[PDB]
From a paper:
Severe acute respiratory syndrome coronavirus 2 (SARS-CoV-2) encodes a main protease (Mpro, nsp5, 3CLpro) that is essential for virus replication. Mpro cleaves coronavirus polyprotein 1a and 1ab at 11 junctions with a conserved Gln residue at the P1 site, a feature with no known human analogs. The essential function in coronavirus replication, together with the absence of closely related homologs in humans, identifies Mpro as an attractive antiviral drug target. The SARS-CoV-2 Mpro inhibitor, nirmatrelvir, was found and developed as the oral COVID-19 treatment Paxlovid (nirmatrelvir/ritonavir).
The crystal structures of the Mpro mutants with the greatest reductions in susceptibility to nirmatrelvir were determined in the presence or absence of nirmatrelvir, including S144A, A173V, A173V+T304I, T21I+S144A+T304I, T21I+T304I, and L50F+T304I. The T21I+T304I and the L50F+T304I double-mutant Mpro apo crystal structures showed that the enzyme C terminus was bound at the catalytic site, presumably preventing nirmatrelvir from binding. (B) (1 and 2) X-ray structure of T304I/L50F double-mutant apo Mpro enzyme electron density of at the catalytic site. The C terminus is colored in pink. L50F and T304I are labeled in purple. The T304I mutation alone reduced nirmatrelvir susceptibility by 3.4-fold, while addition of T21I, L50F, or T135I each slightly further reduced nirmatrelvir sensitivity, resulting in 3.8- to 7.9-fold reduced susceptibilities. The double-mutant enzymes T21I+T304I, L50F+T304I, and T135I+T304I either had no impact on Ki or had a lower fold change, consistent with the lower fold resistance of the corresponding mutant viruses against nirmatrelvir in culture.
Residue numbers in the entry:
A (entry chain B): 1 to 301
B (entry chain A): 1 to 306
Write the structure that this text describes.
């Protein structure tokens, strides 16, 4: 029993965190085999941050300019290649603590753990959700650039995110492990607009199934609705339209509780129109959407 | 920028997690040096749990009856003892991944990170707080007994909690790493219940300091209430009694935000009576009491303009 926001054990990822130093700019790096992945703006100083020419800034840099440090040991760079917004640095040692990794790009609505690092040392770990506008409700202080987002499938660490820049609107922009940014963001410290943040419909429906499993069920009603009728209300409260693919994902959650997918939608519809009237679901008065259907299965099986 | 509930990196604790099997029972063990610590009920059957006599039951058990697995590798048991509700199993190999450690007994209200484990394998990590009634609102299932709670004091892992059982309300109870339970609980299959839970005062205060730092300040007001005046309102809405030493802990946050400790209490008093009216603080309709001032300082950093 109990429903908690849970991060994946960060241990495997911890053995990959190094401190990358280029002149005055120092950030975090991901040491996988003999390659150190870090945001390309490590070559840039507090000067270039407004409008930097990355392709021209790399020209005035050599292997001796980069100072990769694996804790106490000072690794030596033997090659530099800038792919998209990430800088790949080849080193002498092919990391002994390398886990069975893979690089994937997470879709909006999906979740991952973030291991926050400061000066190459892991600080903490928390669970994040990629918002539909491609932003993350995170916590990044000065020196967290290079921190990675990941998922764990038994022994395989799937890397999906790397922190690059702090959004002025409080939010946080970053790239996948191949250097491609999420959303309409670039690695320049300029006024960037995040956009409109819609509530993930399928993640709230998955969270409602977890409340039923935990005994909390004061929100259950006799009403029932169809896909087209429920979607009308979704476009009024900033919610995503539920497709047939979303219903197929909510399979094991519907079979475990017993409540049908179309019947649960009516319980959600009444809580948005009327409200919660001071009562709480799973220890919270707000509809939580940072929990994918796979996150609910992982914790209730 | 930003403010999230954050667990400690669990890496150093994952290297100590083992699977402990005694007869039919399987739970988690904490392998520190050449000793494995686990809940002593692993030696009981479901039948023994109705009225266990752990001393006599441990007399009938020997080293061969304890299968300790460090993943797929097996550790030979060369000794067994009992210290309160924890079973200590001596093994033929010291753990190479043993970090700097100490056993501490946290007070209620304090926080720690939990590494939930199933059959010796870590599944996830979350940030917990010891509730006033000595229970924790965690997320444990069958196979989680022996999952540990900890804090990381820069290089030293302070182990403070071991999971033993779950109560009828879905809340969890456990011991410290010395075997002493937290609360009036016992490792016995009998009727037990958590009791009356209250809201942590010093923790809700610190959370309001963190919201001011992160922009949110619509809940602030020109009111100013005294130490004993606020304590009268606190016992009405189920809150902890605020002491002078509790206010001294809120010192760096008061000096950083420039909001006196009694001024934040006055703003909190209005939030208890009037409410939030739908408007949220840090994206939360309820007041959060799982963040101690120490966790807020650690995340918000801050500068005191002396």
């Amino acid at each position: 029993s109990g429903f908690r926001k849970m991060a994946f054990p960060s241990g495997k990822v911890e053995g990959c965190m190094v401190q990358v130093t280029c002149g005055t700019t120092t950030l975090n790096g991901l040491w996988l085999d003999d390659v150190v992945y870090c945001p390309r703006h490590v070559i840039c100083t507090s000067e270039d941050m407004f409008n930097p020419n990355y392709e021209d800034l790399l020209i005035r840099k050599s292997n001796h300019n980069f100072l990769v440090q694996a804790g106490n040991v000072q690794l030596r760079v033997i090659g530099h290649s800038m792919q998209n917004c990430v800088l790949k640095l080849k080193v002498d040692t092919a990391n002994p603590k390398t886990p069975k990794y893979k690089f994937v790009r997470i879709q909006p609505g999906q979740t991952f753990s973030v291991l926050a690092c400061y000066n190459g040392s892991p600080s903490g770990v928390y669970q994040c959700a990629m918002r539909p506008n491609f932003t993350i409700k995170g916590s990044f202080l000065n020196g967290s650039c290079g921190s990675v987002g990941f998922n764990i499938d038994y022994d395989c660490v799937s890397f999906c995110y790397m922190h690059h820049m702090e959004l002025p609107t409080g939010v946080h922009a970053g790239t996948d492990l191949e250097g491609n940014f999420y959303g309409p963001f670039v690695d320049r410290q300029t006024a960037q607009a995040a956009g409109t943040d819609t509530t993930i419909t399928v993640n709230v429906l998955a969270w409602l199934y977890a409340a039923v499993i935990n005994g909390d069920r004061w929100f259950l009603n006799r009403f029932t609705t169809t896909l087209n009728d429920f979607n009308l209300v979704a476009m009024k409260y900033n919610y995503e339209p539920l497709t047939q693919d979303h219903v197929d994902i909510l399979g094991p959650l519907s079979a475990q509780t017993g409540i049908a997918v179309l019947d649960m939608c009516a319980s959600l519809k009444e809580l948005l129109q009327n409200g919660m009237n001071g009562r709480t679901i799973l220890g919270s008065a707000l509809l939580e959407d940072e929990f994918t259907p796979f996150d609910v299965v992982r914790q209730c099986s």
